[PDB]
Amino acid sequence: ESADLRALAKHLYDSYIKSFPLTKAKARAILTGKTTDKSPFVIYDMNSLMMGEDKIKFKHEVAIRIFQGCQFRSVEAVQEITEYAKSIPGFVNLDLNDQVTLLKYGVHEIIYTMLASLMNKDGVLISEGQGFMTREFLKSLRKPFGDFMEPKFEFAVKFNALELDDSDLAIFIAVIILSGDRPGLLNVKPIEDIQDNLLQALELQLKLNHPESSQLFAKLLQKMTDLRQIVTEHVQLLQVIKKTETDMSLHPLLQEIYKDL
Amino acid sequence: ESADLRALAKHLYDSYIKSFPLTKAKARAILTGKKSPFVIYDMNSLMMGEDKKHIKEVAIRIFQGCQFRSVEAVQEITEYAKSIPGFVNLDLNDQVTLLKYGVHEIIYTMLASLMNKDGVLISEGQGFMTREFLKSLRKPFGDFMEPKFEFAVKFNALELDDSDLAIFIAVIILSGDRPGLLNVKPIEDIQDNLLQALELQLKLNHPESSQLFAKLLQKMTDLRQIVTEHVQLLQVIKKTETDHPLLQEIYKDL
Ligand SMILES: O=C1NC(=O)/C(=C/c2ccc(OCCc3cccs3)cc2)S1
Structure with a gap:
């Protein structure tokens, strides 16, 4: 029944609003100048960086500080995604080891999917939308770190053109999250049973919410390819960072996710 | 309506049959199905294999044989592409770019038709090279075919x-995200027609296979990872087999 698919779509959206405090709708209102939401302080250079601590709520050299800010924010996102994952019907009923596997491989793909909501071609919201850091400033960071966000902006620019x-x-x-082709999954068939249902719901949702957007379903699914590529690029970059910066600490939670291979 | 889509589907099937000699249906007959192929499972059966065309070490020659056949397949794939409605009307640079960045993904997709969990057909179905033998090869040559096998068992489960x-x-082929494309719009416009036709095709041909369309599109992400892993390995070998002239030229890299 298409009715059961609408109710699932409604359940997931409601649980998404409950788990993720900075939605795309809030992010867009900030980015475009709406009266619903307030204006970000903009970090585009080092003085603006230093000025931002006075005006923005934080708790933080500059490339190292910025990169660890992103990783602390990532850790928080893993907390929110994990709480959202529990709400997906059937997920908590799966083998515990496979719940862990799905999260391990799913979480960064979702982080970069949702990061696109906080981005435009010029930069990215930070500190829950109170701040905005320009793309050029990030590209100007010392040698290595200078390229860690550019694959995220490039995808976001194409992803945001879907207008989701x-x-x-x-x-x-x-x-x-419910990809049965993740490495190391014990019981693939229950996972695939859930994804099948989720795919039907997504498909119906895209037809009703975007009835003039031809093959949006297929074009969104093709984007899954870009996410995988961003993740594997990021992992490579992290292997370099940790060799050139032996004094820089990765969070153990992110370290346990990065099993790659 | 759903009728222009059937035209597209049958047109492409017919051109596919003309363009690719060994189809999946025939490879299924040969493999796990009912002229049995000469099997290559070790060094001695390999040697007798060749004895009964490319031009030296065993592991190198097998890799060189994979190049010859893939270069053959690029020509089959190129001919098929020119049969896709609208493709020849695109910017010639864009046709070149779509083929350069697409033939690897298609080669490993069609190669899955010739594989099972235990090995792969070669020499137009006349031979079968066992997977275990390929994994047994020296240096990184034993790692060359293995990830295509793991893709192919997952791809073949779709029973296309x-x-x-x-x-x-x-x-x-009509992927609008290839690097360097000059005019992306008509490419995505064609692909949109192709995806529509693919979706109707799977709904009619596999009415019982729920969300087959989506599951097949998701396999793209594993294809590109495979291709990306492979071109890397392909570079490591540049630093194994070294200093051919016209041969080296014939096998540029694609
Ligand atoms: O080492 C890592 N591991 C991950 O999973 C990373 C993902 C990531 C998360 C958020 C990002 O936005 C930037 C926001 C901020 C800038 C300065 C203070 S806050 C950027 C990247 S980075």
């Missing part, structure tokens, strides 16, 4:  | 036939 909203994205990230 | 694959091959 949070109700669309709620189902999409659920589809991402 | 040639009529399905004919439209999925075209979808891959």
Whole structure:
């Protein structure tokens, strides 16, 4: 029944609003100058960086500080994604080892999917939308770190052209988590049973919410390819960073996810 | 309506049949199905294999044989592409770019048609090279074919036939995200037509296979990872087999 698929879509969106405090709708209102939401302080250079601590709530050399800010924010995102994952029907009923596997491989793909909501071609919201850091400033960071965000901006620019909203994205990230082709999965068939249902819900949602967007379903699914590539690029970059910066600490939670291979 | 889509589907199937001599249906007959192929499972059966055409060490020669055949397949794939409605009307640089960045993904998709969990057909179905033997090869040559095997067991589980694959091959070719494309719009416009035709095709041909369309598109992400892993390995070998002239030229890299 298409009715059961609408109710699932409604459940996932409601749980997505409950788990993720900075939605695409809030991010867009900040980025475009709406009266619903307030204006970000903009970090584009070192003085603006230093000025931002006075005006922005934080708790933080500059490339190292910025990169560890991103990783602390990533750790928080893993907390939110993990709470969203529990709400996807059937997920908590799976083999515990496979719940862990799905999270291990799913979480960064979702992080970079949702990061696109906070991006435009010029930069990225930070500190829950209170701040905005320009793309050029990030590209100017010392040698290595200078390229760590550019693959995220490039994808975001193409991803944001799909014009998805949070109700669309709620189902999409659920589809991402419940991939039965993740390495090391014990019981693939129950996982695939859930994804099948999630894919039907996503498909119906895209037809009703975007009835003039031809093959949006297929074009969104093709984007899954870009996410995989961003993750494997990021992992390579992290292997370099940790060799050139022996004094820089990665969070153990992210360190346990990065099993790659 | 759903009728122009059937035209597209049958047109592509027919051109696919003309363009690719060994189809999946025939490879299925040979493999796990009912002229049995000469099997290559060790060094002695390899040697007798060749004895009964490329031009030296065992592991190198097998890799060189894979190049010859893939260069053959690029020509089959190129001819098929020119049969996709609208492809020849695109910017010639863009046709070149779509083929350069697409033929690897298609080669490993069609190679899955010739594989099972235990080995791969070669020499137009006349031979079968066991997977275990390939994994047993020296240096990084034993790692060259293995990840295509793991893709192919996952791809083959979809149980696509040639009529399905004919439209999925075209979808891959018309990828609007290839680097360096000059005019992306008409490419995505064609691909959108192809995806529509692929979706109707799978719904009619596999009415019982829920969300087959989506599951097949998701296999793109594993294809590109395979291709990306492979071109890397391909570079490591540049630093194994070293200093051919016209031969080296013939096998540029694609
Ligand atoms: O080492 C790593 N591991 C990960 O999973 C990373 C992902 C990531 C998460 C958020 C990002 O936004 C930038 C926001 C901020 C800038 C300065 C203070 S806050 C950028 C990247 S980075």
